[PDB]
Amino acid sequence: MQIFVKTLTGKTITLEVEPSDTIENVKAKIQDKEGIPPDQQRLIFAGKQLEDGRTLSDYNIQKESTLHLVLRLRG
């Protein structure tokens, strides 16, 4: 299924994913298309940060769903 990902520039990229994919799988696919290392990705969907180990189905993430990619400003 095709979801959307808002990247660190605000631009929307498509991502080719399956309800089965874990959050690590999606983070890996974002690396493949946008180059961001998974270790730095944080994914925001409907106010939740998606969790390594859960699946996209666990979030009712379907086709045309938008995820928002962010990094970390630590302190």
Binding site: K6, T12, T14, K33, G47, K63, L71, L73, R74, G75
Partner: protein, 326 residues
């Protein structure tokens, strides 16, 4: 000196303290946290820890501690020395609290305060295929690079994009298709959390410290699908969560005008200090130290969201539980 108390830095908990003051002065939220049934296993309940911190910032005359709250996360002491991102905490802490409010007198408070709805329109350019998606949000990621101010950054957010090439739209029986995508806001919540995208990826995470101006009053009617001539979407700046440093690490403070009255203080962990508007807004524009998260409250709901909280809002059962805990 200020009327408000600070929060102790356990070691690297600047993020939590700045978030906690931010949520603490979201009065309507604090009112609801006090009303959560923790009658709950001590130092295992994030709500009980949140009531304890909120009670203490409201009553103490010395800086307040957050040891039991980090305990209720499941954390060992070492974790209180790992630096963190305030918006990442905010997402997790509000989610936890929201779920813990389900089935109580105060269910729905966090989405009532913080949750809005987006709509995204997708229109194929070379075939008759349209589609629709409406998603709830609790904060908004706003791009910074190349944008002068918050207003241009909303304009960019709502601007039409081309879904083309490797980003063609999967238009069903028509297969991949060039398309336009556009986003608009259906609603804006009474408390608006803006996360400024002050980062970009030498293969490293680099903080963007470029100048990004934000206003005291923010008109957002332009970025709604339908405007309500009754309740115009005019917002008042309440908080500036400021980050100083790099992507690896740094320091967090937060500036707040708690009553929404333009009288500002600064909250650097244990020290709260009066400050000017100029020091909370213009001096945080960047261009090391700058705004990372902005909190705006909808003018139509300032009276309710920032309603004065007193001891009649803290249940006596909790007052007994908290004091009878030595």
């Amino acid at each position: 000196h200020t009327g408000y108390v600070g929060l102790k830095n356990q070691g690297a908990t600047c993020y939590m303290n700045s978030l906690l003051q931010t949520l603490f002065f979201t009065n309507q939220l604090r009112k609801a946290v006090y009303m959560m049934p923790t009658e709950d296993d001590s130092s295992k309940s994030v709500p009980l820890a949140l009531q304890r911190v909120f009670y203490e910032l409201q009553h103490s005359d010395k800086p307040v501690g957050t040891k039991k709250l980090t305990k209720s996360f499941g954390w060992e002491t070492l974790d209180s020395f790992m630096q963190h991102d305030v918006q990442e905490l905010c997402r997790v802490l509000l989610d936890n609290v929201e779920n813990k409010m389900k089935g109580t007198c105060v269910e729905g408070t966090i989405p009532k305060l913080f949750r809005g709805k987006m709509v995204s329109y997708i229109q194929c350019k070379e075939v008759d295929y349209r589609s629709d998606r409406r998603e709830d949000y609790y904060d908004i990621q706003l791009s910074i690079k190349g944008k002068k101010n918050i207003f241009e950054s909303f304009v960019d957010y709502v601007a039409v994009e081309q879904l083309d090439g490797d980003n063609k739209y999967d238009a069903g029986e028509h297969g991949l298709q060039e398309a336009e995508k556009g986003v608009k806001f259906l609603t804006l919540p009474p408390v608006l959390h803006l996360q400024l995208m002050r980062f970009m990826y030498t293969d490293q995470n680099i903080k963007i410290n470029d100048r990004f101006e934000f206003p005291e009053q923010l008109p957002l009617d332009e970025f709604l699908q339908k405007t309500d001539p009754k309740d115009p979407a005019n917002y008042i700046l309440h908080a500036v969560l400021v980050h100083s440093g790099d992507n690896h690490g740094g320091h967090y403070v937060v500036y707040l005008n708690p009553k929404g009255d333009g009288k500002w203080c600064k909250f650097d962990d244990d020290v709260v200090s009066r400050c000017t508007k100029e020091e909370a807004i213009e001096h945080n524009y960047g261009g090391c130290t700058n705004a990372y998260m902005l909190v705006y409250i909808r003018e139509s709901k300032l009276s309710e969201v920032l309603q004065a909280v007193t001891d009649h809002d803290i249940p006596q059962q909790l007052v007994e539980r908290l004091q009878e805990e030595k």
